[PDB]
Amino acid sequence: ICQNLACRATLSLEDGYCKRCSCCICHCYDENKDPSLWLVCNSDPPYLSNSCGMSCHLKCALKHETAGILKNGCYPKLDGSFYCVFCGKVNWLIGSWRKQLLIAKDARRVDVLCDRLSLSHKMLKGTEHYKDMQNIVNTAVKKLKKEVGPLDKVSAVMARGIVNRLNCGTEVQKLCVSAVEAADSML
Ligand SMILES: [Zn+2]
Ligand SMILES: [Zn+2]
Ligand SMILES: [Zn+2]
């Protein structure tokens, strides 16, 4: 019996974690699950092959090389895609990348903006196929960094701030809109 209130799925002897609600990397579930912070192995276009349905935190996939996003000597790096860490199936990142930018451009809080933009920035780092898209994101990040420093290390004082009160806030959010449109136009 799963202890996650929003799941309560029956577990087995096999399980070191519940497959339905928990991340297959860190073996943790979220209290109020936000699907935009998760990746799921599925058979959606453009990758129709058989999938396992296993899920992980987007952040966990970015942090560990086995997912084929973080460049490593061991794993052939993918461009705009990830390896499901369970079954190995290649899945697309672009849907997730889009979602991060849509939340960023509408964000009122600085920490949301920094966090979401940083994820998009990492997801497509070193891309060849999506260069034009990501160059817009790179421009937005460089602008934001000049005001808050490294996006992942933003101070608590800046974090509680309002995006509109930043000197570059509206400019950065305009760039987020631009990046999403660029993705939509190419695809
Ligand atoms: Zn569960
Ligand atoms: Zn995780
Ligand atoms: Zn899978």
Residue numbers in the entry: 135 to 321
Reproduce text from the manuscript describing this model:
We next expressed the equivalent fragment from several other plants species and eventually succeeded in crystallizing the equivalent protein fragment (VIN3123-326) from the palm tree Phoenix dactilyfera (Pd). VIN3123-326 produced diffracting crystals under multiple conditions, whereby the best crystals diffracted to 2.1 Å resolution in space group P3121. VIN3123-326 forms a single compact domain, with an N-terminal ZnF and a C-terminal 4HB, packing tightly against the central PHD module. The topology of the α-helices in 4HB is up-down-up-down, with each helix packing in an antiparallel fashion against the preceding one, thereby forming two straight helical hairpins that associate with each other around a hydrophobic core. The interface between ZnF and PHD finger is relatively small and exhibits only a small number of interactions mediated by water molecules, while that between PHD and 4HB is more extensive and formed by conserved residues engaging in multiple hydrophobic and polar interactions. Notably, one of the key interacting residues in the latter interface is Phe216, the aromatic residue upstream of the final two zinc-coordinating cysteines, which constitutes part of the PHD signature. A striking feature of the VIN3 PHD superdomain is its extensive positive electrostatic surface potential. The positively charged surface patch extending across the Pd VIN3 PHD finger is formed by basic amino acids from each of the three subdomains (R142 and R154 of ZnF; K167 of PHD; R232 and K233 of 4HB). Notably, the long loops in the VEL proteins contain four highly conserved arginine residues (R242, R243, R294, and R299 in Pd VIN3) that are not present in their OBE counterparts. By contrast, we were unable to detect binding of purified PHD superdomain from Phoenix (Pd VIN3123-326) to H3K4me2 nor to other histone H3 tail peptides (methylated or unmodified), including H3K9me2, which was previously reported to be strongly positive for the Arabidopsis PHD domain (see also later).
A PHD finger signature is found in plant vernalization (VEL) proteins, which function as accessory factors of the Polycomb system to control flowering in Arabidopsis through an epigenetic silencing mechanism. During vernalization, VEL proteins associate with Polycomb Repressive Complex 2 and are required for epigenetic silencing of the Arabidopsis FLOWERING LOCUS C (FLC). Here, we use structural analysis by X-ray crystallography to show that the VEL PHD finger forms the central module of a larger compact tripartite superdomain that also contains a zinc finger and a four-helix bundle. Our evidence argues for evolution of a divergent function for the PHD superdomain in vernalization that does not involve histone tail decoding.
